[PDB]
Amino acid sequence: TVAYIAIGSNLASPLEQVNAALKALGDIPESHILTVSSFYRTPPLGPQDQPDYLNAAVALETSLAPEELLNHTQRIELQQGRVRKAERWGPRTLDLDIMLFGNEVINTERLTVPHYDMKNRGFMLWPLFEIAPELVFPDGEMLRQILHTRAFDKLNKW
Numbered sequence: 136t137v138a139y140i141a142i143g144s145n146l147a148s149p150l151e152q153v154n155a156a157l158k159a160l161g162d163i164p165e166s167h168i169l170t171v172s173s174f175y176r177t178p179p180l181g182p183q184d185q186p187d188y189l190n191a192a193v194a195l196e197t198s199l200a201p202e203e204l205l206n207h208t209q210r211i212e213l214q215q216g217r218v219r220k221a222e223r224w225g226p227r228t229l230d231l232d233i234m235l236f237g238n239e240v241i242n243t244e245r246l247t248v249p250h251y252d253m254k255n256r257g258f259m260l261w262p263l264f265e266i267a268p269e270l271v272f273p274d275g276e277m278l279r280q281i282l283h284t285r286a287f288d289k290l291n292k293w
């Protein structure tokens with residue numbers, strides 16, 4: 136299964152957080168990285184008195200079950216760094232979101248895939264388009280069509 140993971144951080148050195156997270160993701164059992172997007176600097180969505188985010192997307196091939204993958208991404212969020220901040224609306228030391236898990240839809244207490252708001256977030260869609268321009272979502276909608284219709288501004292590189 137190709138999982139697409141969104142990475143974000145705006146605290147505790149986002150470049151260090153993202154590099155450490157990518158290394159850890161590549162070492163998840165039964166998994167390996169196929170592609171990583173460019174690293175982008177994006178203005179915060181939500182409260183404006185917080186630093187800019189580093190956002191990226193990574194295609195990860197995995198034979199893990201979705202919940203098993205989530206166990207590992209959550210373990211990484213806990214093991215990595217000296218301090219974890221995960222406040223609603225930010226700031227965020229490190230988020231590893233499962234944006235898409237193959238073409239599957241999951242709606243459990245722990246896991247909602249596709250990510251529930253990704254179609255409204257340019258900082259998720261543009262890095263994904265860089266690495267999967269022909270992607271079609273589980274509901275049949277085309278990624279390129281969403282970007283055409285919504286006209287999300289393109290992103291600057293970190």
Ligand SMILES: CC1(C)Nc2nc(N)[nH]c(=O)c2N=C1C(=O)NCCN1CC[C@@H](S(=O)(=O)C[C@H]2O[C@@H](n3cnc4c(N)ncnc43)[C@H](O)[C@@H]2O)C[C@@H]1C(=O)O
Nearest residue numbers: 143177178179180181188224225230232233245246247258
């Ligand atoms: C401040 C804001 C809006 N502004 C930003 N601005 C820019 N420019 N750039 C950004 O990057 C950026 N980020 C921002 C931001 O808020 N980021 C956090 C995004 N995200 C993280 C995961 C979940 S969570 O509530 O933190 C944890 C629980 O979710 C459960 N869970 C369910 N489904 C999941 C899944 N598919 N993957 C992982 N966990 C999942 C899991 O079981 C846990 O209990 C929902 C949360 C959200 O979107 O609300």
Ligand SMILES: [Cl-]
Nearest residue numbers: 249272273274
């Ligand atoms: Cl969908």
